Ligand binder design. Structure first.
Ligand code: HEM
Ligand code: HEM
Lengths: 182, 182
């Protein structure tokens, strides 16, 4: 993925557990060569998955748990490293936000013009709840979507209850979630 | 499950959408031959599954969204229908309360001779985080655990974020939840 993402992980790790750690992880994930990530340059997803795996081992935490925290972080990190106005333009409620998210990523993608955004379709089951459809060219990131989702809860002082009901990894067509919100 | 599980479902639906809706929902579950649920009486689990499945059709929500709801509602309903004090006795805080859960359901089991209760194990990540291990003889109730915890959050004036990191029905040994709390 574009190196913003890996910068993102490096800085979450760095803020939380120090630099020492980041570097072991960066070494473990087999990436010591690279001296910094280039925010607007593209990488092989490999780079991102190995980072996550290293992080797990060094930190002794489930990969899934790091994805979840990473999803939460990103929401704050984007609003702060040059995308806060774009974020805000995507709306000021969670449901509105989730409808604008493909357009959000579309705006982004005309700058990062090699972007492989995900797709998100909402089916509202009420004014407090929906089925969310997560469609992706990649595997493994559902847990990120949950962190992401709780992060947007914070941003909007909204309380979000989230549960996966369908699973790409098992060969189903895409990930689906049921979401209850304040 | 024991009848009060079912009275509680009935109660919720009825309070939230009236008795015609509820009647309808009963009929659809193929339980017209039942004028009332007997709280302290053991029913086949089918009754409960059927009722949820039937209530998904009639309200146009997924089961899983209802289970989240039911999970929330259970917490209030029990404090009002004869288990207020057993609840208090379980603790003044969420972590504490979950730690006590196997102990609470044991106490319930005195009274409920053939109870088949869940088993909850807590690993404490931090003063404000836990891994919840949820183990069960039954399938499909993880969404409820999620609702349950939100109700507990409400009870103890505590904001909570629950993320399920592992899933009994893709073949994993048991549901594991990552949790973060005030
Ligand atoms: C300022 C806000 C955002 C920016 C700049 C942004 C940008 C990006 C970028 C650059 C990627 C990597 C795609 C690639 O390299 O091909 C990505 C992936 C992703 N973004 Fe965002 N994004 C933002 C907000 C969000 C939000 C709020 C969500 C909420 C769910 C989200 C969900 C995702 C997901 C799930 C992926 C994974 C890629 C995949 O599934 O294929 N993004 N985003
Ligand atoms: C006064 C409080 C509570 C009472 C009296 C109670 C009682 C029961 C009863 C009677 C059942 C049905 C079991 C059976 O029929 O064999 C049950 C199931 C369950 N209870 Fe509780 N419970 C209480 C609080 C909680 C809380 C706070 C949770 C939080 C997560 C919880 C989680 C569960 C779960 C997950 C089941 C599902 C059954 C299964 O997985 O096999 N309970 N409980």
């Amino acid at each position: 993925m574009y190196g913003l993402v890996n910068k993102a992980i490096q800085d979450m790790i760095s803020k939380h557990h120090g630099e020492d750690t980041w570097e072991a992880i960066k070494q473990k994930a087999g990436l010591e060569d690279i001296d910094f990530f280039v925010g607007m340059e593209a990488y092989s997803d490999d780079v991102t998955y190995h980072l996550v795996g290293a992080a797990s081992e060094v930190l002794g935490k489930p990969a899934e748990e790091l994805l979840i925290a990473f999803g939460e972080y990103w929401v704050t990190y984007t609003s702060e490293e040059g995308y806060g106005e774009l974020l805000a333009s995507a709306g000021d409620s969670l449901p509105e936000f989730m409808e604008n998210l493909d357009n959000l990523h579309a705006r982004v993608g005309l700058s990062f013009p090699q972007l492989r955004p995900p797709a998100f379709e909402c089916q509202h089951t009420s004014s407090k709840s929906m089925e969310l459809h997560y469609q992706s060219t990649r595997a493994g990131l559902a847990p990120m979507v949950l962190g992401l989702l709780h992060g947007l809860g914070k941003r909007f002082q909204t309380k979000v209850e989230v549960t996966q009901t369908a699973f790409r990894e098992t060969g189903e067509d895409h990930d689906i979630f049921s979401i209850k919100y304040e």
